Amino acid sequence: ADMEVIELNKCTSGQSFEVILKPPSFDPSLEEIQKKLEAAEERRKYQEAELLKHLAEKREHEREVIQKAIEENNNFIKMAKEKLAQKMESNKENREAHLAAMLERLQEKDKHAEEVRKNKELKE
């Protein structure tokens, strides 16, 4: 171009100099905030003690399945036990009473030969 070169400082291991070429042509980060850094630590410690009290949730019901299983089993055994004893001493009390019901007509048509043989005590 043909420059004008203003020479800003000569040195030992060097040397600077501008060359303005063509006229220019116009006319607190602050502290406090690791208050931020622990509200992240806080939003973590929540969001995560949550997907944890959510797993104590998942737990308690575990117990309740294992527990409402066996719980509804002592339903079956301890009902089929007395669906027998009270349908099998309902039954034993049935025929036992019916055996007498038979031995009855037979105690009677019996005390009947007694009643008309003490009838043979009259024949003249």
């Binding site: 037979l106 030969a113 043989r117 043979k120 024949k123």
Partner: protein
């Protein structure tokens, strides 16, 4: 699983003595001793009818009851008398009277205990007592009268175990007494209450099988007893033979009797008869079925036409192609399909046993719970009402201690049994 036998009254005993001697021959037993015969099966079930005693020996489980010496010394001095235990005989001394009251109340219950004392011994010394069966006449007194007493005294002691009777229903032709109606009716009432099955052997029928089909002019109490003895053997077979499997006789009951009252079976036999008249053995299975099912061939005087079959048990005899039995039996329930009740399915069961009776290469026998039986009772209750009419011979009972209306009571009861057999020709 093991059964006692009571055998009471002239007829009861004359039948029993023959029955016993017939079966004793099937199993093969000496007058006294034990087995002699090339067969082996025999003694599998000899248990059931023979409580066996010291030495070899095979004494039958039999009580003989009667109300006079008479027909006991008959058996002992005759066919197989050396067999029955010397003190299984209960004597009588007095009369039978041929009078039901006598048998059932006075002269009978006089004895009664000494019979029970002996039944209690045989039974109490059973392993598992099946029950009792009894033979006896139905008309005439010691047989029917004391008999029905005995069974009434047997229930009560043993409600438990089951009641079986061979009861010979009496008839105008071949009878000794004007009173048979009374005697029969009075026991018929008793039986309907106290037994579980009764084989209705009609004395009427028996005689008919001898004149109408047998060219036998003047029939004894003998060649007549020969029929029942044969019939009895064939009826009992399953209790005392196979391993196919067993017949509880309780099982027999539960299967034959639909309704608690109606235990009245007409028996029937395959081939029949006697001495120089048996020459046949041309008996075939087809010819054997048609014959065991023919009215002309029942042991009760009633044609199983009027009246259908409730249930039927039929049991053949002798090594024969049972493949053919099945389909012949099926043919009977087709050429006669109408006369087996529609409301009890597969209600006829047939079995075969391959050891023939006395003589006879082939045989068979039939047990039928039939409402044709209705006719039998009607026909006794018809000559009965006919007498109780203007209270006929009744005074013989009246003053033996019996009640006027105890007859009407037995008349009523039986006339109902007719009513129910009739109720069951239904839909």
């Amino acid at each position: 699983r093991e059964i006692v036998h009571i055998q009471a009254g002239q007829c009861g005993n004359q039948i029993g003595a023959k029955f016993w001697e017939v079966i004793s021959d099937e199993h093969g037993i000496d007058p006294t001793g034990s087995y002699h015969g090339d067969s082996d099966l025999q003694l599998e079930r000899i248990n059931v009818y023979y409580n066996e005693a010291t030495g070899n020996k095979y004494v039958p489980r039999a009580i003989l009851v009667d109300l006079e010496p008479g027909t006991m010394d008959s058996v002992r001095s005759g066919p197989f008398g050396q067999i029955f235990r010397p003190d299984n005989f209960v004597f009588g001394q007095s009369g039978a009277g041929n009078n039901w009251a006598k048998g059932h109340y006075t002269e009978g219950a006089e004895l009664v205990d000494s019979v029970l004392d002996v039944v209690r011994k045989e039974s109490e010394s059973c392993d598992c007592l099946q029950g009792f069966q009894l033979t006896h006449s139905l008309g005439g007194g010691t047989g029917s009268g004391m008999g029905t007493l005995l069974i009434s005294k047997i229930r009560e002691e043993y409600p438990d175990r089951i009641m079986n009777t061979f009861s010979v229903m009496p008839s105008p032709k071949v009878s000794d007494t004007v009173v048979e109606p009374y005697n029969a009716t009075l026991s018929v009432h008793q039986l309907v209450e106290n037994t579980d099955e009764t084989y209705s052997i009609d004395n009427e029928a028996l005689y008919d099988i001898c004149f109408r089909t047998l060219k036998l002019t003047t029939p004894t109490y003998g060649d007549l007893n020969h029929l029942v003895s044969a019939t009895m053997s064939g009826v009992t077979t399953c209790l005392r033979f196979p391993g196919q499997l067993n017949a509880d006789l309780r099982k027999l009951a539960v299967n034959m009797v639909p309704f608690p009252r109606l235990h009245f079976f007409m028996p029937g036999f395959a081939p029949l008869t006697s001495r120089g008249s048996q020459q046949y053995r041309a008996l075939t299975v087809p010819e054997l079925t048609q014959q065991m099912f023919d009215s002309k061939n029942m042991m009760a005087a009633c044609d199983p036409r009027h009246g259908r079959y409730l249930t039927v048990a039929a049991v053949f005899r002798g090594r024969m192609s049972m493949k053919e039995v099945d389909e012949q039996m099926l043919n009977v329930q087709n050429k006669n399909s109408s006369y087996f009740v529609e409301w009890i399915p597969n209600n006829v069961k047939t079995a075969v046993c391959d050891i023939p009776p006395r003589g006879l290469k082939m045989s068979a026998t039939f047990i039928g719970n039939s409402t044709a039986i209705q006719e039998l009772f009607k026909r006794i209750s018809e000559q009965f009402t006919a007498m109780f009419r203007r209270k006929a011979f009744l005074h013989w009972y009246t003053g033996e201690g019996m009640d006027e209306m105890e007859f009407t009571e037995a008349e009523s009861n039986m006339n109902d049994l007719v009513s129910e057999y009739q109720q069951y020709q239904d839909a």
